[PDB]
From a paper:
In this work, we engineer EUGO, a VAO-type oxidase, to catalyze the selective dehydrogenation of 4-n-propylguaiacol to isoeugenol. Similar to VAO, EUGO is active on various 4-substituted phenols and contains a covalently bound FAD. The oxidation of 4-alkylphenols starts with a hydride transfer from the Cα atom of the substrate to the N5 of the flavin cofactor. Consequently, a p-quinone methide is formed and stabilized in the active site. This reactive intermediate can subsequently be hydroxylated by the base-catalyzed attack of water, or tautomerise to the dehydrogenation product.
Interestingly, this additional mutation (D151E) resulted in a similar conversion compared to the parent mutant and similar steady-state kinetic parameters, but it displayed exquisite chemoselectivity by producing insignificant amounts of the undesired products. This prompted us to create the combined mutant D151E/S394V/Q425S-EUGO5X. As a result, the less constricted and tightly packed environment around the Cα atom of the substrate reduces the formation of the covalent adduct that impairs catalysis. The engineered D151E/S394V/Q425S-EUGO5X mutant was named 4-n-propylguaiacol oxidase (PROGO). The crystal structure of the D151E/S394V/Q425S-EUGO5X in a complex with 4-n-propylguaiacol was solved at 2.4 Å resolution. It showed that the bulkier E151 sidechain points towards the propenyl Cα atom of the substrate, potentially sequestering the reactive quinone methide and obstructing attack of water. The Q425S mutation renders the environment on top of the substrate less packed, creating a looser niche around the substrate side chain. This allows the 4-n-propylguaiacol to rotate slightly away from the flavin N5 as the substrate side chain can partly occupy the space vacated by removing the Q425 carboxamide group. Gratifyingly, this eightfold EUGO mutant was found to display all desired properties: conversion of 4-n-propylguaiacol led to the rapid formation of isoeugenol as the main product (97%). Characterization of the purified enzyme revealed that the kcat had improved by two orders of magnitude relative to wild-type EUGO, whilst retaining the thermostability of EUGO5X mutant. By introducing two more mutations (D151E and Q425S), a variant was created that combined all desired features (stability, selectivity and activity), acting as an efficient 4-n-propylguaiacol oxidase (PROGO).
Residue numbers in the entry:
A (entry chain A): 2 to 526
B (entry chain C): 3 to 526
Write the structure that this text describes.
């Protein structure tokens, strides 16, 4: 029947719902099954129901977020704060803890508070999407560009608060995060950095302020509800060129990664975040699985060759963008061609050179890499009927043999659980991300369970090989946090200890990143 | 005899022996003669302050655990340092008098790893910039380090006070990647991929999984750091350092305003731009008495003599470029066209000045190329028994803000009879007004003048909306008090976390104005 917060009666919840309505207004509290359906994980993981929200409250202001937090303390209601709630791949808007109330900050707190052309920064509310901020910069003939992930409909703030990434030189969103406002778990409000000094202009200029630097503690965290966040914005460069390098062989991965890293570690000639996508990923962006293979089980070699041939793509496809005066772009492109040119079968294409279906991903990278938000990459989910995805992203050293081992290890398990291997190898400066998107039929309970059991295996095996996940789904946060158990889980004990100090009543997103406040510890949900 | 607060002669003597049982008899100092060397070398205020009770030098992480556990038992406050060279901010001296200094760097001074492939170091606290430079030279490294002005500090300890250098990797804390820390009750923790047993990425990926804590251990008293990683930048094929002299006090406005556009895209100004006033560059190469032996502020005549003799401006801009010679030349050309629009602007590369005035340029050419130096110690010869205090408000990188800040500080410096040694430094979007006040450390009134002058500068800067990035023991309470948005919400947040991790209030009480429960309200 009715989803309730843990240890909270029908009466007590009805009372708390009304207190919420007194703060934000009747139409900004959802609690009917019909109203809540939209806030369930759109890509559900596992056959069983999980991650069930009891209600959605949409606050209009920081003060309203304080009031909601104080009520949640009164009634012991757990709050799952989101911005836009588009964390698709990691649970969407759905709370880790079933019965939690979703605080959708972004519905009404969606205002651009400042875009400074002189100093190159924005001060944003959670509700500001990449499309909102893009449209604002266009409107105002801005000299600035934003840094967006593959999908423009997410929150600049929300994405930053899960340490999301884009593909411009400003792709590490949390680095460029500068100052935030946060409602702490008992309702008091705090500004970090120069925000903490009344009348400073430097909130979005100097990240650290004075004393311990806390902003990090509010990312992949449950230590408060963020109401404002500053972010630095790069100046748009005078020109840019996007290029695709197709690599013919599965085994080329080793040489590609080993040539990638020297070209990237000095942020030149690879100026942007280098992404290497397998043919599955690029095929899924432009085609249905059944275009290639309507059989059961893993995709055969003949089918993969047909994908490569028809799309004129390799097994591994490298995407990069260069920025600056055309001479500098041409110099950097020349270096890139010489270095990756030593791999037999490497073929090169600029964004101007491919208008065919195989080229559509390059055209999308040319947008995303230039801070032009897109939703083209939603086409991935038409690979199979009713397509959803889960993100599996272990962090690796950027070595060719280390990539090769991860390639084998994950494709092998993928095959066993009848899921295709959609994978990208991405490099920051000195780290490698194995970005695996498993696409499955969300309507099929067996496919959902296969995904939950497969990724549980993939997490454990990756950790046995010394690979930690940078980010994970609601279903895997306990399993993943368990892997960071150096010194008898010293890290988790440190986090719990702080969680209990700031959230004595255990209100804020209990179980986020495997961090449960005292009142829930040992209870298996 | 200096004792910890609320600890008897007999309890302390017991505790000193327990320390000896852990680290050895030789590695516990507690005589007045032994402790002299660990007093603030640039003392602030007339009165005695910042008195250590003992110095304990541990050999290992395990020993640090044992010391912290003993400290918890006896309620002894511990001030963890690396090398203890935080000169201008108290040196090795503890904020709280009676604290035991834990000099981690004395014996924990080992380079644990330098990775040529991935460009990083994993370091203990005692590794100095000289130590790590020597290592890189020895091993024919492709890598360069990022050092502050003085090479004798700790790579780790400087990072833990969010210190800065002048290469593209000038933000030390940014490039910090992984640490190991002994938390205030003696348990040991590794951050990031350090927390995943057998990961290779401790020094490759900073964040790891869940909340990002590393920042909480910088300008902090939440533990004793025993290892720290840091990224090292590949040495580029060539570099060129350059000096722009600017003739006029009033040029500051246009310098800062041309400086920001050339810096924010990290090109053409590829390194940290530093603008030094003639006082700064003169004190680097000469004594005060060479220019003016009279009492009180230095007259216009004397300033003009400094400029002529050293062939420098009132404001001197020092930068470095890196890469292929064609790139360096292109960038230098853009810099010359931009700053050239200021009348009286003159340009010199490091190759074009072998005179005394050029000595600072030569020292920057070293520092900006990750070659540690001690040349800038000559600043302390400006007056007899020279010491300095660091006063560094953070500002918008705006000409008129720089100009306001220049007047505001020089006026108060004048009033308290201290010379105005100042640099304007710029990261990407922020500006540091770095003011070194050089004074006679043997003169109790010069000491009191410094304390009272900087107290005034701190609240006057705060009234103008400027916060300090970093400050001295004597000012930490005053400085933290200025960050009082939402009724001092930030300090309240820091205090709850301090009390959660340090229930006995052991680790560096009062660091950054953060006192644990047992000390709050006691005025030391
Ligand atoms: C399916 C998919 C997903 C995807 C992607 C490609 C595909 C095909 N590419 C991505 C990429 O390139 N980079 C990236 O970082 N993510 C990518 N994803 C995943 C996802 O689409 C995006 O990351 C998305 O932008 C994230 O969702 P959103 O931006 O809406 O953020 P949120 O869901 O509202 O909040 C995220 C989490 O952070 C915490 N949170 C959020 N807001 C707050 C506030 N105000 N206070 C406290 N905590 C907050 C919550 O834990 C929330 O779940
Ligand atoms: C006088 C002076 C000072 C100076 C400078 C120029 C002059 C003329 N130029 C500097 C510069 O360009 N950049 C910079 O960051 N600092 C500069 N200074 C100040 C100072 O000399 C240096 O910053 C110096 O590197 C700091 O000294 P050191 O490196 O020895 O650091 P420390 O005293 O040992 O530690 C600093 C503080 O951090 C905490 N700490 C240190 N180690 C630990 C450990 N292991 N665990 C926990 N906390 C630790 C303490 O609070 C300590 O006081
Ligand atoms: C090809 C990149 C897609 C992608 C990148 C980073 C992510 O975190 C992600 O989450 C599911 C998806
Ligand atoms: C002339 C630059 C010296 C300098 C720079 C940054 C600092 O923090 C500092 O501390 C006292 C001194
Ligand atoms: Ca072939
Ligand atoms: Ca032992």
């Amino acid at each position: 029947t009715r989803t309730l917060p843990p240890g909270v009666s029908d009466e007590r919840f009805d009372a708390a719902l009304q207190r919420f309505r007194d703060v934000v207004g009747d139409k900004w509290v959802l609690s009917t099954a019909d109203e809540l359906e939209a806030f369930r994980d759109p890509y559900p993981v596992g056959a069983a129901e999980a991650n069930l929200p009891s209600a959605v409250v949409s606050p209009e202001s920081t003060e309203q977020v304080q009031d909601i937090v104080r009520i949640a303390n009164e009634y012991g209601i757990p709050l799952h704060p989101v911005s836009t709630g588009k964390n698709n791949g990691y649970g969407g808007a759905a709370p880790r803890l079933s019965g939690s109330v979703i605080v959708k900050t972004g519905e009404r707190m969606n205002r651009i508070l400042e875009v400074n052309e002189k100093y190159g920064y924005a001060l944003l509310e959670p509700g500001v999407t990449y499309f909102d901020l893009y449209e604002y910069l266009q409107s105002h003939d801005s000299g600035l560009m934003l840094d967006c992930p593959e999908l423009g409909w997410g929150s600049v703030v929300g994405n930053t608060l899960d340490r999301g990434v884009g593909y411009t030189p400003y792709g590490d969103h949390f680095m460029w995060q500068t100052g935030l406002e946060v409602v702490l778990p008992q309702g008091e409000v705090m500004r970090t950095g120069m925000g903490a000094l009344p009348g400073s202009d430097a909130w979005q200029l100097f990240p650290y302020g004075f004393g311990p630097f806390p902003d990090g503690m509010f990312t992949q965290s449950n230590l408060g509800i963020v109401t404002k966040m500053g972010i630095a914005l790069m100046q748009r460069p005078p020109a840019s060129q996007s290029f695709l390098i197709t690599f013919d062989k599965e085994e080329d991965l080793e040489q590609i990664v080993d040539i990638m890293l020297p070209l990237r570690i000095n942020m030149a000639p690879l100026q942007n975040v280098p992404v290497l996508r397998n043919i599955f990923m690029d095929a899924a962006a432009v085609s249905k699985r059944t275009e290639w293979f309507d059989g059961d089980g893993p995709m055969p070699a003949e089918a993969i060759e047909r994908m490569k041939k028809d799309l004129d793509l390799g097994f591994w496809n490298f995407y990069g963008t260069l920025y600056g005066p055309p001479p500098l772009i041409e110099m950097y492109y020349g270096m890139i061609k010489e270095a990756f040119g030593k791999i037999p079968g490497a073929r090169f294409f600029t964004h101007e050179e491919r208008d065919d279906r195989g080229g559509h991903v390059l055209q999308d990278r040319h947008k995303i890499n230039n801070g032009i938000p897109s939703l083209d990459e939603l086409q991935l989910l038409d690979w199979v009927p009713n397509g959803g995805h889960i993100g599996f992203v272990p962090v690796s050293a950027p070595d060719g043999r280390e990539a090769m081992k991860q390639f084998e290890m994950v494709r092998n398990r993928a095959n066993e659980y009848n899921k295709d291997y959609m994978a990208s190898f991405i490099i920051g400066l000195r780290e490698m991300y194995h970005v695996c998107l498993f696409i499955y039929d969300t309507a099929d309970p067996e496919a959902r369970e296969e995904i939950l059991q497969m990724t549980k295996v993939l997490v454990r095996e990756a950790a046995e090989a010394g690979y930690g996940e940078y980010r994970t789904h609601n279903a895997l946060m306990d399993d993943v946090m368990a892997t960071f158990n150096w010194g008898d889980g010293a890290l988790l004990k440190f986090h719990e200890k702080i969680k209990d100090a700031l959230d004595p009543n255990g209100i804020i997103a209990p179980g986020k990143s495997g961090i449960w406040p005292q009142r829930f510890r040992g209870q298996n949900l």
